[PDB]
Design a protein around this ligand. Structure first.
Ligand SMILES: [Zn+2]
Lengths: 114, 94, 60, 91, 69, 135, 244
RNA sequence: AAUCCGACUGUUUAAUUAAAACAAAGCAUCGCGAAGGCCCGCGGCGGGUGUUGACGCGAUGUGAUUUCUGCCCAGUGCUCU
RNA sequence: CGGCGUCCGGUGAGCUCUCGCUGGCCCUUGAAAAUCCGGGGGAGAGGGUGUAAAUCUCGCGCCGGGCCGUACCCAUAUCCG
RNA sequence: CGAAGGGACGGGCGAUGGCCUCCGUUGCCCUCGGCCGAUCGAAAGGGAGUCGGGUUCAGAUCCCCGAAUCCGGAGUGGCGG
């Protein structure tokens, strides 16, 4: 049993000083400074508690080197809108447009009759 | 009343409970009428009515809650959208 | 020397009333006796479910 | 009655703060932590996230309401009274 | 480093302009073919004896073929 | 009753072609023992034609009036019927159930449907089918 | 004598408001053409909790009728406001809970909150946690309106200002007592350093006009005149009566 | 086993006094609808409360729970026309 | 410079760290900005039947990354008394 | 109690620069435009990207060996897809 020290000048257990234990080929144990755990993007509706699928969850400045297909999903409103609510917006916008046609037909008969 | 007329179907007629199962049910069109709850989402108010006017299906809006509509069918769970297959001996359809 | 002593601990030796400093909840807590028992018993009922020993109604 | 006789939710407050002040908040703590039913879905998943705010677990319909109860007795009378003047203006 | 599975891709990699000396390892039925490029150490694993020698004379550009002991 | 007809305009719910407009050409509504759910064969467009505005001439209006089409079997619960109707021919010798197994004929089916969809975009007939749904 | 406490609260720097975790100012919309003549429709996205305030805030998003953006507002939520509910704003808007519209236009007797005192300052009156304002009568000439404020005083205000219809969500906050010093310590920690109030009798007479003596007594009449100087206006300030 | 005090957790005179002292939830008042109440500032179309609006802000007295809080406005204050 | 070896397994409410799920408490609701990314749109582009504009860069290749601190103690002897 | 932008896309005019074919440069004109204000403020907050072995009397994620990775550039685009 051997005890080990830090490798940097940060001797505080802050959120930017999170380490993991690993074994070297030199037959000793040393700390490895981990990166922060990224989070998947949220949906634009705000009514789905989960996070988007098919998109990598990593720190936001790591998104530059990732590919296009790794950052979104091949769909309309892809990579920023959950699949549950985007297809509900299709059937939300369509029924308004049909109802607006219904209202203006009943509005038109009012012009002709009175 | 409506609920007393509805419960006659329950032990005699054929019925389908649930939004998804009645969403496909209207698409064959052998159903005649649907009951909608008042508290169900406003998107799914018009969604059934647009399918119903394609299949010439009558729409009746229940005054009670979805929990009360579930108790009106004799079941112990709430129901949002239901459709009748064939009334046994009831005149819910006119 | 401890390995000789721990073999007596497997046989219950040096573990009378007069060598017990903690409570019953301190040594083997009342939670873990319940925590364990709900793995063995609830697994036994579910393994008997797909083997058709007990149907859904009596198992529930 | 099963475990304690009449203290219940204020059984955590112990011998202190008097019986009456413990008795006053006993009606508050039950209504504060009660799983109320929903007026949108119907499921009993209504919780107090913060002061005056009412949130559902299933559809997550977030309703501004009372500090401890879901609907206060003032607001239900106000809503009925303000509806009375709605068709009174309209007719 | 990049692991190469099939033979001919190593031949096209080893004749690249940026490539340099090839280091040969004999891991007692795990003969490895390591070639140094500017970015990646491309290694080819050969698990059979007789496949090794036909790749010895298949290096065109007179590149360094130092036997790594 | 049954309102999915081979001339019905149907919106697409999910998939890569979400929000696009499709015309039913084949309605199985039975299941073929390999696709057991009820389903239909639809023909739709992907790239909507842009504005024309009668001011960009003759070469650019042809460029703007370009339509990219597709074909794919969708679910009945993954589709949205209208009470609009387009009676575009889409003859049965090209668009069939045996087209998805051959990518060469699926390019042929898309190409054949593209020309027939292009002609109906002209002359102002069935005009609502040719603007993208504003969602 | 040194400067007494309370007198020290006017200089600040220890007694200033804790506005770090606060989410903004609770104000109504600014006046424009759409609000003055017709109505504009808004969507309540979500409801948040403002630290140091007993009332929740409703996050209402409007679309600007002039340039293509969505404008976010900080509305005080009425009791009965849910997310996704359409909220109307203007003169032509209808009469229901969660609908701000001018005071000169609805019939008298309604229950309104977040009342605007002067026309064009986005609401000032009756917006604390559950308070409300009631309208007694209108006046078509001179465009005046008598509104009963929650303090009981009736103020004649202009008919061009507006309020949101309903009561403030979060009523009955003072019904449950604190029951602890810690819950009182945490209550004012979000607001400002004013909770540990030491009574002036136990204090030494150099910090207070009531302190001193071998017995904990005041020694002077606690009712002090209105025109008293600072450091002397301590106690019952210009009391008309003192008892029950 | 009793008596007194403080209900309690907490804080207090760093370096003689850790308490029955202070604070504390509770209780009862007073002023104020914003050109306002309290206060700071030599000064300003200044500033804090206030990213606040009577379920709030500011100044008080008492000190958990239970019970009760009687009489007196002649005096000194405060306030009203 | 060589010879070999650096092996097989099972456990435990075991201690520590990390990830994830769920629950409880608030009159406490628990930070901002730099920066990056995705989507709605189609202002515009290119090419005419062998080729281009494009390549939120698909793979490989080239160059560069400038300034300051980096020794030792970190405590019954390297600090303040 | 403020004439608080010196920025940008496209087009027109004129010029130089390199094989003024092309690309590039700047001046004027048309056009678009906000965002809450200069600036400072954390070696424990946010913050892209380095690890293994060896090596010194005293430095080593910094020196050597070997493996990577991030950012910026590229006109003629350096090559392929
Ligand atoms: Zn609900």
């Amino acid at each position: 049993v051997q005890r080990l020290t830090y490798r940097r000048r940060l001797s505080y257990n802050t959120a930017s000083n999170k380490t993991r234990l690993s074994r070297t080929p030199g037959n000793r144990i040393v700390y490895l400074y981990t990166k922060k755990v990224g989070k998947a993007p949220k949906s634009a509706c705000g009514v789905c508690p989960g996070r988007l699928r098919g998109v990598r969850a990593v720190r936001p400045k790591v998104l530059m080197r990732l590919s296009k297909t790794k950052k979104h999903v091949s769909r309309a409103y892809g990579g920023s809108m959950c699949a549950k609510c985007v297809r509900d917006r299709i059937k939300r916008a369509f029924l308004i447009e049909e109802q607006k046609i219904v209202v203006k037909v009943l509005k038109a008969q009012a012009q002709s009759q009175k | 009343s409506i609920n007393s007329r509805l419960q006659l179907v329950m032990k005699s007629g054929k019925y389908v409970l649930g939004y998804k199962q009645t969403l496909k049910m209207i698409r064959q069109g052998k159903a005649k009428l649907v009951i909608l709850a008042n508290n169900c989402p406003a998107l799914r108010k018009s969604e059934i009515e647009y399918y119903a006017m394609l299949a010439k299906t009558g729409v009746h809006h229940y005054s009670g809650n979805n929990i009360e509509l579930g108790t009106a069918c004799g079941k112990y769970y709430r129901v949002c959208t239901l459709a009748i297959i064939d009334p046994g001996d009831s005149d819910i359809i006119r | 020397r401890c390995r000789k002593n721990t073999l007596a601990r497997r046989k219950g030796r040096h573990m009378g009333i007069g060598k017990r400093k903690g409570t019953a909840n301190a040594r083997m807590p009342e939670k873990v006796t319940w925590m364990r028992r709900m793995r063995i018993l609830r697994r036994l009922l579910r393994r008997y479910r797909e083997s058709k020993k007990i149907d859904r109604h009596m198992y529930h | 009655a099963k475990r304690t006789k009449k203290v219940g939710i204020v059984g955590k407050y112990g011998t202190r703060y008097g019986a009456s002040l413990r008795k006053m908040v006993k009606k508050i703590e039950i209504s504060q932590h009660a799983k109320y039913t929903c007026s949108f879905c119907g499921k009993t998943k209504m919780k107090r996230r913060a002061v005056g705010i009412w949130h559902c677990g299933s559809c997550m319909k977030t309703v501004a309401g009372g500090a401890w109860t879901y609907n206060t007795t003032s607001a239900v009378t106000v809503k009925s009274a303000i509806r009375r003047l709605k068709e009174l203006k309209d007719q | 480093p990049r692991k190469i599975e099939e033979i001919k891709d190593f031949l096209l990699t080893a004749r690249r302009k940026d490539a340099k000396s090839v280091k040969i390892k004999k891991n007692k039925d795990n003969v490895k073919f390591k070639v140094r490029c500017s970015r990646y150490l491309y290694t080819l694993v050969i698990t059979d004896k007789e496949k090794a020698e036909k790749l010895k004379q298949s290096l065109p550009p007179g590149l360094a073929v130092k036997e790594l002991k | 009753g049954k309102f999915m007809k081979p001339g019905k305009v149907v919106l697409v719910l999910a998939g890569r072609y979400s929000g696009r407009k499709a015309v039913i050409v084949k309605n199985i509504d039975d299941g073929t023992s390999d696709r057991p759910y009820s389903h239909a064969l639809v023909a739709g467009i992907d790239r909507y034609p842009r504005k024309v505005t009668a001011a960009m001439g003759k070469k650019k209006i042809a460029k703007r009036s370009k339509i990219k089409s597709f074909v794919k079997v969708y679910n009945y619960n993954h589709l949205m019927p209208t009470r609009y109707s387009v009676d575009i021919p889409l003859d049965k010798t090209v668009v069939n159930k045996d087209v998805f197994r051959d990518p060469a004929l699926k390019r042929k089916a898309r190409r054949e449907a593209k020309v027939k969809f292009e002609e109906r975009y002209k002359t102002g007939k069935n005009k609502w089918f040719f603007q993208k749904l504003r969602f | 004598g040194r400067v007494i406490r309370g007198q020290r609260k006017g200089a600040g720097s220890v007694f200033r408001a804790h506005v770090k975790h606060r989410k903004g100012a609770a104000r109504l919309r600014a006046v424009d053409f759409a609000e003055r003549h017709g109505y504009i429709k808004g969507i309540v996205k979500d409801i948040i909790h403002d630290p140091g305030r007993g009332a929740p805030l409703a996050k209402v998003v409007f679309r600007d009728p002039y340039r293509f953006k969505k404008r976010t507002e900080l509305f005080i939520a009425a009791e009965g406001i849910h997310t996704g509910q359409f909220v109307y704003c203007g003169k032509k808007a209808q009469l229901n809970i969660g609908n701000v519209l001018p005071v000169g236009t609805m019939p008298e007797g309604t229950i309104v909150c977040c009342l605007e005192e002067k026309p064009g300052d986005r609401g000032k009156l009756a917006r604390a946690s559950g308070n409300y304002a009631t309208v007694i009568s209108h006046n078509p000439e001179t465009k005046k309106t008598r509104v009963k404020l929650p303090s009981g005083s009736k103020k004649v205000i202009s008919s061009a200002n507006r309020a949101v219809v309903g009561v403030v969500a979060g009523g009955g906050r003072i019904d449950k007592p604190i029951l602890k010093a810690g819950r009182a310590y945490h209550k004012y920690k979000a607001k400002r350093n004013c909770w540990p109030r030491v009574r002036g009798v136990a204090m030494n007479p150099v910090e207070h006009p009531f302190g001193g003596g071998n017995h904990q007594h005041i020694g002077k009449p606690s009712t002090i005149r209105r025109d008293a100087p600072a450091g002397r206006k301590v106690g019952l300030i210009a009391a008309r009566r003192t008892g029950r």
